[PDB]
Structure 1
């Protein structure tokens, strides 16, 4: 297995910049017959991958002039000249030289903007649920940038992980933010057993954590 290593994970650009992506191999992809089999794929969200460039510099029929690849042996690059909106997606490298075929981790290009601190909201359990025997507390953390946040729940000062559920927005095509939900699912008796519920968002926008709590 020839390990592929694409960096960075998220390349943030603005429209019309150059996008530069690196792909490194655990050994030469130059085949014993002179050809090097390094391939690049774009997967736009909600769709499949497509062949942008096989064998390091050849554009597959239909790819535009703004995608051209370069490199040799173990180190390879894709440079997008002017990032249009339809170039946003996940770019994956592949090597077909050795068995098995292997791909590299992927690279997401997200549009840049300033920061945005998360607007947190903490939600007490619904009456309807407590009748059904459950208690789940939801924190909503909306419109922030970058996609990097830490959310810790603290049920009476002490923190809790066992039983957290978390989900994510991709980039909003309005104001290029991310949003998140964190649902701590407790049981009616754990809920009755305890009183203050804390939800904390640690992210570059505050050095001091963004906090949100309630007491039952």
Structure 2
């Protein structure tokens, strides 16, 4: 029941860079602190135990150290394979406590999204609903802005967005934006536009379709 304070909560680092994660305990733990990495598939895997002893098979580029209160994990040279969330753990006192964790995002070159729009399926329509979907794929940075426009006017109500966690293979993100209306509202407008604004471009990426004519 010792509180572990971890920093930074998150960071973006270019591959090859040095990363230092730090953990502080609310009371003495005499080096009984581990650093585990939770891989993207949920897998938890200890890297260091006893504050600075590497587990076997753990790459030599990881190392722990203690500086008074400070417990430090250092990754000299980030590898793509080190894409994960890192947490520190104190196993000194009977109620084990983890650090807040650190969400590591791998810094990368700009990437413009590949925008695609999808009109409501016939199945949904028969159901009385109309969901227009737009997929903004493989971009970077994660910051992106999506606007929905029915005919001319920009619709704000009924949009449900969802981002993708950084792709562990190409360091890009994807987004999915959905505007949901009833079949009666859908059936009485024409063009449905999904325009995205991203750092990679000055003008909005626009995709649309006019319904009408089955």
TM-score normalised over the length of structure 1: 0.76
In the alignment, structure 1 residue 7 sits paired with structure 2 residue 8: yes
Matched, 1:19 2:14: no
Measure, in 1, the Cα distance between the counterparts of 2:202 and 2:92: 48
Residues 36, 73 of structure 1: 8 Å contact kept? no
Q: Gaps spanning 5+ residues in structure 2: where?
A: none
Q: Would the aligned equivalents of 1:18 and 1:79 in 2 still touch at CA under 8 Å?
A: no
**2:148 equivalent in structure 1:** 153
Distance 1:68 1:181, change over 3 A: same
User: Between Structure 1 and Structure 2, how many residues are aligned?
Assistant: 208
The answer to whether the Cα contact below 8 Å between 1:118 and 1:143 also exists between their aligned partners in 2 is yes
Native 8 Å contact 1:29 1:37 kept in 2: no
TM-score for the superposition, normalised by structure 2: 0.77
- Greater alpha carbon shift after TM alignment, 89-98 vs 47-56: 89-98
Match for residue 205 of structure 2? 210
Range with bigger deviation, 186-195 or 140-149 = 186-195
For 2:157 and 2:4, how far apart are their aligned partners in 1? Answer: 33
Choose which of 24, 33, 55 in structure 2 pairs with 1:38: 33
In structure 1, stretches of 5+ residues that fail to align are: none
Deviation at 1:41, TM superposition (A): 0.8
Change (3 A) 1:13 1:29: farther
Q: Give the corresponding residue for 1:86.
A: 81
Show the counterpart of 1:118: 113
